[PDB]
Amino acid sequence: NLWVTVYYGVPVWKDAETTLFCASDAHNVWATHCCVPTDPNPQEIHLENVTEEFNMWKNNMVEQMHTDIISLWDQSLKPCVKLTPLCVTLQCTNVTNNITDDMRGELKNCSFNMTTELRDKKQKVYSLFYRLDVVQINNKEYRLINCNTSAITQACPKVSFEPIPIHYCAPAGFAILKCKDKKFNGTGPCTNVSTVQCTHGIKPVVSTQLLLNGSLAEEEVIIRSENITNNAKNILVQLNESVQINCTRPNNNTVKSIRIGPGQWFYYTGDIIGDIRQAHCNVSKATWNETLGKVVKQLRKHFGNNTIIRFANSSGGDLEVTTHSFNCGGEFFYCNTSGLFNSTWISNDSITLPCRIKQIINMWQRIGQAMYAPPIQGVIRCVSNITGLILTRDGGSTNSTTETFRPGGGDMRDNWRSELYKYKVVKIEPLGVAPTRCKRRVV
Amino acid sequence: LGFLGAAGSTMGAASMTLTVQARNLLSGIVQTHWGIKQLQARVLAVEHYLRDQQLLGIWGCSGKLICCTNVPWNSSWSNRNLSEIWDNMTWLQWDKEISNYTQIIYGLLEESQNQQEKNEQDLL
Amino acid sequence: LGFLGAAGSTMGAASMTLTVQARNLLSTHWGIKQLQARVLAVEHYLRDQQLLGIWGCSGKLICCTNVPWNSSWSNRNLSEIWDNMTWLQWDKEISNYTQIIYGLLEESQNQQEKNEQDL
Amino acid sequence: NLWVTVYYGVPVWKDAETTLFCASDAKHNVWATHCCVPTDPNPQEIHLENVTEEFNMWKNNMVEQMHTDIISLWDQSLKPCVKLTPLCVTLQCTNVTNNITDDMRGELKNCSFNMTTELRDKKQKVYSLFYRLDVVQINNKEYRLINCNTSAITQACPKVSFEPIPIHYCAPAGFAILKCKDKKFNGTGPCTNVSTVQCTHGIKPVVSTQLLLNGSLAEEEVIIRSENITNNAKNILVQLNESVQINCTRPNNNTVKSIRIGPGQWFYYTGDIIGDIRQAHCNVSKATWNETLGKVVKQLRKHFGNNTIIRFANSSGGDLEVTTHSFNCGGEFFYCNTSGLFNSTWISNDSITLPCRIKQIINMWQRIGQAMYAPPIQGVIRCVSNITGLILTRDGGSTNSTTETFRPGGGDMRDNWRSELYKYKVVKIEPLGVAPTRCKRRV
Amino acid sequence: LGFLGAAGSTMGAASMTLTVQARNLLSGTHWGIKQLQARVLAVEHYLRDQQLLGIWGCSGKLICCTNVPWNSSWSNRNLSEIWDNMTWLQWDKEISNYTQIIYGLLEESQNQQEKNEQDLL
Amino acid sequence: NLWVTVYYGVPVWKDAETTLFCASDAKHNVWATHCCVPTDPNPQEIHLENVTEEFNMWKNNMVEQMHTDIISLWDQSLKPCVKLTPLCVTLQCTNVTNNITDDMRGELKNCSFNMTTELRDKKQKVYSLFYRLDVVQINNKEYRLINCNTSAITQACPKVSFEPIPIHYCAPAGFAILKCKDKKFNGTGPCTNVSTVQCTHGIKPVVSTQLLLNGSLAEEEVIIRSENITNNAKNILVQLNESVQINCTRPNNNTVKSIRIGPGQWFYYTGDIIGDIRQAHCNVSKATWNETLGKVVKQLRKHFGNNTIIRFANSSGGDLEVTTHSFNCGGEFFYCNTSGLFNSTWISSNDSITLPCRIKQIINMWQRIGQAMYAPPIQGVIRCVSNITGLILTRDGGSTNSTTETFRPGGGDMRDNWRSELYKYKVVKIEPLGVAPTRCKRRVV
Ligand SMILES: *[C@@H]1O[C@H](CO)[C@@H](O[C@@H]2O[C@H](CO)[C@@H](O[C@@H]3O[C@H](CO[C@H]4O[C@H](CO)[C@@H](O)[C@H](O)[C@@H]4O)[C@@H](O)[C@H](O[C@H]4O[C@H](CO)[C@@H](O)[C@H](O)[C@@H]4O)[C@@H]3O)[C@H](O)[C@H]2NC(C)=O)[C@H](O)[C@H]1NC(C)=O
Ligand SMILES: *[C@@H]1O[C@H](CO)[C@@H](O[C@@H]2O[C@H](CO)[C@@H](O)[C@H](O)[C@H]2NC(C)=O)[C@H](O)[C@H]1NC(C)=O
Ligand SMILES: *[C@@H]1O[C@H](CO)[C@@H](O[C@@H]2O[C@H](CO)[C@@H](O)[C@H](O)[C@H]2NC(C)=O)[C@H](O)[C@H]1NC(C)=O
Ligand SMILES: *[C@@H]1O[C@H](CO)[C@@H](O[C@@H]2O[C@H](CO)[C@@H](O)[C@H](O)[C@H]2NC(C)=O)[C@H](O)[C@H]1NC(C)=O
Ligand SMILES: *[C@@H]1O[C@H](CO)[C@@H](O[C@@H]2O[C@H](CO)[C@@H](O)[C@H](O)[C@H]2NC(C)=O)[C@H](O)[C@H]1NC(C)=O
Ligand SMILES: *[C@@H]1O[C@H](CO)[C@@H](O)[C@H](O)[C@H]1NC(C)=O
Ligand SMILES: *[C@@H]1O[C@H](CO)[C@@H](O)[C@H](O)[C@H]1NC(C)=O
Ligand SMILES: *[C@@H]1O[C@H](CO)[C@@H](O)[C@H](O)[C@H]1NC(C)=O
Ligand SMILES: *[C@@H]1O[C@H](CO)[C@@H](O)[C@H](O)[C@H]1NC(C)=O
Ligand SMILES: *[C@@H]1O[C@H](CO)[C@@H](O)[C@H](O)[C@H]1NC(C)=O
Ligand SMILES: *[C@@H]1O[C@H](CO)[C@@H](O)[C@H](O)[C@H]1NC(C)=O
Ligand SMILES: *[C@@H]1O[C@H](CO)[C@@H](O)[C@H](O)[C@H]1NC(C)=O
Ligand SMILES: *[C@@H]1O[C@H](CO)[C@@H](O)[C@H](O)[C@H]1NC(C)=O
Ligand SMILES: *[C@@H]1O[C@H](CO)[C@@H](O)[C@H](O)[C@H]1NC(C)=O
Ligand SMILES: *[C@@H]1O[C@H](CO)[C@@H](O)[C@H](O)[C@H]1NC(C)=O
Ligand SMILES: *[C@@H]1O[C@H](CO)[C@@H](O)[C@H](O)[C@H]1NC(C)=O
Ligand SMILES: *[C@@H]1O[C@H](CO)[C@@H](O)[C@H](O)[C@H]1NC(C)=O
């Protein structure tokens, strides 16, 4: 009765992994890379009667995100002035004047020899450094902290790294499926799915401990975790309300520069204008307490209402392991959140978090060439929105019904999973067959 | 309707949306080692397009979005009525259901077309 | 005659040189640009071939279609178009009505494809 | 009545920008190495009967590629050459006074410095002669090379030739080159003597400022072309219909010396001179030049009126690259005075010697960045070149006095190639189209 | 037999393997470029053959009769020798100096045929 | 009464060279890193019945990729490694007499210099042992390294393995590889036992001079192949049907020291030697060698006459790269003497022969003037055993018709090493379209 009929242009697809295009809305690094415009605005086709499975922890879009961000970064530093000539013995003293007690020992006044553009001529340099970038050799002799492990390169002062939003676009033959179910927890079937050509804009914001300047959850705190009962996994907490945080490095500065080589310029500090104070960030405690209450009741959904949830500080490690970390106006801040994660939940009033500043940056947890951040003239202040948190369980319980949670942090991929969880990439497969009462006519 | 808007539609309902589905396979007209990555992506799109076109040519369906063949449908693959298949089932569901017979049908279709051309030589 | 040679004559005359024109289409830093150029030529070729397939007459140099000609595009008579105009002039004359036809051709192609299935 | 008929292989086209490739018309030079692709045994030009087409040399894109290609090639060829960072040392210099014609007082200086040998610890005292044009005072005084405060210095490789052998540009598949053969084509607008071709003729990538050497000639009369005739913000290009020869020399007999300054790293220097010191210079017939100007002023009056007076004056000032006639002769770089060529008023041996300067370190392309350095050339240099055209400018600020002074012009290197490229346009071939007919598909 | 298994077989016998041969033609920083160049040229060759069959009106066939007569100046061998004794490798050598001629005979007869058909609708 | 018929999918081809790609089976080995592409299971072959093809191993240009890609990979591997530029300083050296066999004859030197450390203002006195072959006197005497006047020296990365693994070469779509199975094939001419494969078996990229190690053996008999038999300027490639084992040792116990020369830049050096000092050497059974030569001389005579005398001798001279048997054993570079091996006349418990070997650290790899490689010392004692599978020989020529000829070890060209494995393969391009006559005219409706 039935015969095989071949149909081409069949609207079906398979899971697939491909290369994506980066595009943006028309000197930074991002816009000079993601040069493909997102300027036109076609939107999406909702798929009626389509259920599809998503898994944010098994996605590869995040790998492409991670890889390309790092590669872009390296390309941007590639053509900049090297600091090799700076790996010399430094003679340093302490800073005792015009400084508060809390800052004593943080800064050092160093003096050293440097070359000039002529090979047989040298100059003395006087500059001020943070102790985090300088170690003792054993007034005392010091060296820069990374001259024993890797080359140090100065980032170009005219290159902006501002994380403008970027969009990813499918290559022809592929499509991006998007889950818009407000209750989606990161895995499994989603029944409200639309198809798009490009993702919405995502800002490639880099941070530790807290998730800044991302999307908010819709009407609830959503906690997404690959393995809920496994303390080896972190959890991503998405808030439906932002929390405002005001950060600054309040002291005024000077920026000086010298020529070391043939058009090779180096930037450094000199003096602090006014006195010396600690960098810090301000959050109202009222909003912080409200935020935690929302998070805590959400956590209890997996532990029981009667569970006591305690917060505590980081377990230990380097600054990129234990502190909050972000770029504010081009500067690199490390903030102590131990006084933030200090409550226990049992069934303006601001908080100031002290912060440290560091100029030699080991990015991506990749030991290799270090980046040097030249100083910024003036006083830096910025305001950011906290949109989520990275936390961990201690685990190792005795079923006490009480558990302490710690700020997490670690991998950077997680910073993008929080935005990319909604997207899936598939390959279109237009060819297929089906039965029909139609025999080919043979002549 | 729109591209892939027919994905949740029944197989029958979706049979009339094939032109958009086919046209957009070549939509990538308008659009460092980065350039190399994208260059390969373009090459792959071409390679996929061509393997499907060659196969339709092999089966004698080069001029058709929809072609009847002389390979009978085998009820052992899916012993279900035509009415369910076209009016209730969607193409996504259908494809999953017959995903383990693809290697059979391609072989049957290749030889069936070869047989017809060979048989034509007795006319010529 | 010569490739692009017929451009000096009428639309009608040029109909026998279509295979001339159809023949040359497939004729460390630096090589990147050259390889991309080769890719683009292929993409343009394939697009046009796909469109002819979309519009039914995939194998013809010339095909009549089932889309009627509109006087709103051109109301000039054939006795003047085919004999007095060149293809360049013609293309310039109807340059607004391209993107619409491409769509009309699917409409006038797929209906008969359906009315071939019920055999 | 009428139906749409689809045609494929239709002989029509559209203006386009695509990438062209180069070919060499039949042995270490850069041009031959790069344009390794052979040219056709003979291109054919197909005339198009009954056509008119519009060309515009100032809106061309072929020139942009030529510019890009020449810079790319230039740099790629210099990438593997010896870097001369070791020369940026304090120099001890005095004037050369023996056997010097008074016109050459100053100019050369006798410098001495301590150069690094292939071993790091050993140094040599090296003596050499440099032109003052490449050397500045630091303040038997201390001196440095002019570019040690700006950029890297690279020695151009002595084994690499830059002879501007003519290169042909060829269309990629799907594209064609149109050529304008009209005798009077002024660089813009409709052209009726139109033909098509696969490739252009060979164009010699000759580089010069002010006066154009070894280019094409006008076929009937001197023709002057400009983007905007009445706008003094634009230059004018004069294509002569007859060539004028210019004889250029560097009379001093140079002895080349060299030193190994690294592991197979060789530096070449000027050594000393055999015989008396004389200045470089160029010879042009006066009568020939005067006749040439006559031919030019006749064309200029076509735009300005019978009653006008055309005066010529010298350049306005600036870098040697713009104030002098900058060109390569025998591998050496000449910066010749041209005031003697532009000192006359036209109202409605018999030769001139132009003095020339020689400069070794060059900021080619008007780029700020690394500068090439010519190696010294052994012996005495002589060449004879053909003057084929000029770059000129209007004075501007006219009071309608009927007298106008023209000044030597100059400009971007692209303008030197527009001189050939005004004859060409590139288009894309578009084989599909439709037309009406009394023919319905036989459905 | 399998891909190229028919290479030593006679011309007639070899007509039975035309689709294995067809399928295996298509279903395939300095390093990456060498690979891409190979892939691109394979496509270009593929397309030329398809284009040419299209030019001749043979795109829908593995084998097509044409309107161009066979010449004794190319081969004066018996039809039975050609199909029953000879192989395609031998044959290709035998007529290797005429293929470039034949191609344009096919082009013209196809153009005349399409024109004749156009005149009838 | 016949018509032209066009046929597509015709199983024919044209000879052609194209780009080949590599693959390998089955962890910092450079070969594996590059040939990351997997191989498939072995059923990639069809025998071609009724096909005779002409092969020519010396006109086979796939070997050119072997001698291009191998070079490229080598340089790619060294590209990111530590530069030794800062070490080109005046050295002050003396001899060593401590527990040394007399026959070292000053091979090693006790030498020191002022090295620049990671802080630019500091020096470190460094003491180490050097081979005489790496060091040239300037004139505690002053010396410099041999290559500081010619090129940069780069230290090879100690974490990268260079052990050759079999590499398979695979055809791109549209191409196929024709394999000759004729056991008597002499490198050229028609072959009737021809099969087609899409990818070859793997060949280890072993690099050596004079003697060919770890290759394939001939079946049944020794086969001698050359481009022009009576032209004494050609290399003779001898493929043995039995291997000969050779035991190569660098017997002294070693210490490897390292110093930081820059910001994460480490240099490795020799320290001192544990125990007394002995010469490097290789051991070959004399009888096995003598039997091997007997097989070879019979095969040589069949092309020169069977009334001749075959003589073996060492090379005429040149640098170590051509006068010695050059090879990599355990990562170390050996330059072994062969004059006592090639010392014979043939006229119509093991008793092995020990050959002395020299060791070098500064290497002019590929006999290419350009960047030099520095081989860091290897901790411990090295011993390896290799399979001698063939020879490279040349003749003196200059015949006086004395029915006597002298054969000497040849070498230098590396392509010739791979030809010994590649002679069985040819690459062709498929041409599926063609025409033939028929009784059928196109039917026109
Ligand atoms: C989370 O998201 C918020 C925004 O929603 C980000 O906040 C922005 O941060 C950047 C960087 O610190 C701010 O940019 C700076 O603004 C200064 C103030 O602007 C003056 O000038 C403008 C005109 O351009 C006036 O309209 C305005 O009233 C002020 O008078 C500038 O002075 C700064 O200039 C410096 O950088 C530029 C490079 O762009 C150089 O060219 C200058 O010479 C100079 O060095 C700079 O432009 C921005 O204003 C903030 N936006 C808002 C709304 O506050 C957070 O940073 C982000 N958080 C994270 C973690 O990503
Ligand atoms: C720059 O280098 C010079 C040496 O060239 C240092 O000067 C020496 O300092 C020590 C310690 O005070 C004295 O004992 C020496 O006599 C000084 N030598 C000379 C030539 O002056 C100088 O201190 C270094 N300066 C900096 C800022 O590092
Ligand atoms: C999604 O499924 C619904 C049914 O759940 C489809 O609704 C049908 O719509 C047609 C046209 O209006 C009616 O004739 C049918 O009677 C409706 N079905 C039922 C059960 O009432 C809807 O069209 C589907 N969407 C898509 C894109 O196919
Ligand atoms: C290889 O060649 C032999 C002939 O030498 C082929 O054998 C013939 O096969 C046909 C099959 O139709 C028989 O009718 C003939 O009688 C056979 N000839 C003889 C002398 O016995 C063989 O088939 C060829 N094989 C391949 C793969 O081409
Ligand atoms: C080459 O090395 C091998 C070891 O890999 C030697 O083989 C051994 O020889 C001894 C006799 O001296 C036997 O007792 C062992 O059983 C053999 N071992 C193996 C694995 O076969 C071989 O003799 C050496 N050849 C030369 C010339 O030195
Ligand atoms: C400088 O400050 C640090 C931190 O307070 C302290 O450890 C160190 O001893 C101080 N050194 C001097 C100069 O007293
Ligand atoms: C955030 O979630 C809480 C808990 O579901 C809800 O009470 C609150 O109104 C939500 N806030 C917003 C802005 O939607
Ligand atoms: C938590 O709050 C108590 C209030 O008495 C304070 O003593 C303690 O130091 C705080 N802990 C942290 C980490 O800030
Ligand atoms: C149908 O399927 C059965 C096995 O279920 C198999 O034996 C038979 O050969 C198949 N027929 C066709 C035409 O595929
Ligand atoms: C398929 O067959 C069953 C059993 O006869 C029947 O109930 C069902 O309605 C048929 N399917 C459709 C879609 O009609
Ligand atoms: C076309 O129309 C013109 C009037 O503009 C008329 O002169 C000419 O004969 C017409 N051609 C025909 C016969 O269709
Ligand atoms: C070389 O160095 C010495 C330092 O002892 C200095 O006096 C001399 O002037 C230098 N020579 C030159 C030519 O610069
Ligand atoms: C032009 O000539 C005058 C007179 O000799 C001179 O003063 C002026 O500097 C010259 N300008 C240039 C650019 O040569
Ligand atoms: C060092 O050894 C060499 C042999 O390699 C010898 O010629 C030289 O005289 C020896 N020098 C001393 C000081 O023993
Ligand atoms: C380092 O240089 C000094 C120069 O005063 C010399 O005496 C010393 O021996 C050198 N060190 C070495 C290891 O050669
Ligand atoms: C090697 O060749 C010789 C002579 O050709 C023969 O006697 C011997 O048996 C062969 N050995 C093997 C393993 O085939
Ligand atoms: C091969 O060598 C012989 C002897 O050297 C010579 O006569 C001959 O010309 C060479 N070439 C050939 C194969 O003819």
PDB file of N, CA and C and ligand atoms in Angstrom, chain D residues 90 112-114 125, ligand 12:
ATOM      1  N   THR D  90      75.247  56.550  22.778  1.00  0.00           N
ATOM      2  CA  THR D  90      75.786  57.874  22.654  1.00  0.00           C
ATOM      3  C   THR D  90      76.940  57.856  21.666  1.00  0.00           C
ATOM      4  N   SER D 112      82.089  58.023  16.241  1.00  0.00           N
ATOM      5  CA  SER D 112      82.669  56.853  16.867  1.00  0.00           C
ATOM      6  C   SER D 112      81.864  56.386  18.064  1.00  0.00           C
ATOM      7  N   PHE D 113      81.758  55.069  18.194  1.00  0.00           N
ATOM      8  CA  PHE D 113      81.001  54.440  19.277  1.00  0.00           C
ATOM      9  C   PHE D 113      81.481  53.023  19.653  1.00  0.00           C
ATOM     10  N   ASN D 114      81.088  52.531  20.863  1.00  0.00           N
ATOM     11  CA  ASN D 114      81.388  51.182  21.370  1.00  0.00           C
ATOM     12  C   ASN D 114      80.237  50.209  21.041  1.00  0.00           C
ATOM     13  N   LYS D 125      85.404  49.367  19.074  1.00  0.00           N
ATOM     14  CA  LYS D 125      85.233  50.758  18.747  1.00  0.00           C
ATOM     15  C   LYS D 125      85.059  50.827  17.247  1.00  0.00           C
TER      16      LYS D 125
HETATM   17  C1  LIG G  12      84.030  53.314  25.162  1.00  0.00           C
HETATM   18  O1  LIG G  12      83.933  53.258  26.640  1.00  0.00           O
HETATM   19  C2  LIG G  12      84.923  54.113  27.374  1.00  0.00           C
HETATM   20  C3  LIG G  12      84.796  53.850  28.893  1.00  0.00           C
HETATM   21  O2  LIG G  12      86.053  53.445  29.513  1.00  0.00           O
HETATM   22  C4  LIG G  12      84.676  55.613  26.973  1.00  0.00           C
HETATM   23  O3  LIG G  12      85.596  56.500  27.612  1.00  0.00           O
HETATM   24  C5  LIG G  12      84.841  55.748  25.434  1.00  0.00           C
HETATM   25  O4  LIG G  12      84.609  57.117  25.045  1.00  0.00           O
HETATM   26  C6  LIG G  12      83.818  54.825  24.694  1.00  0.00           C
HETATM   27  N1  LIG G  12      84.134  54.938  23.254  1.00  0.00           N
HETATM   28  C7  LIG G  12      83.314  55.444  22.338  1.00  0.00           C
HETATM   29  C8  LIG G  12      83.790  55.528  20.922  1.00  0.00           C
HETATM   30  O5  LIG G  12      82.178  55.848  22.635  1.00  0.00           O
END
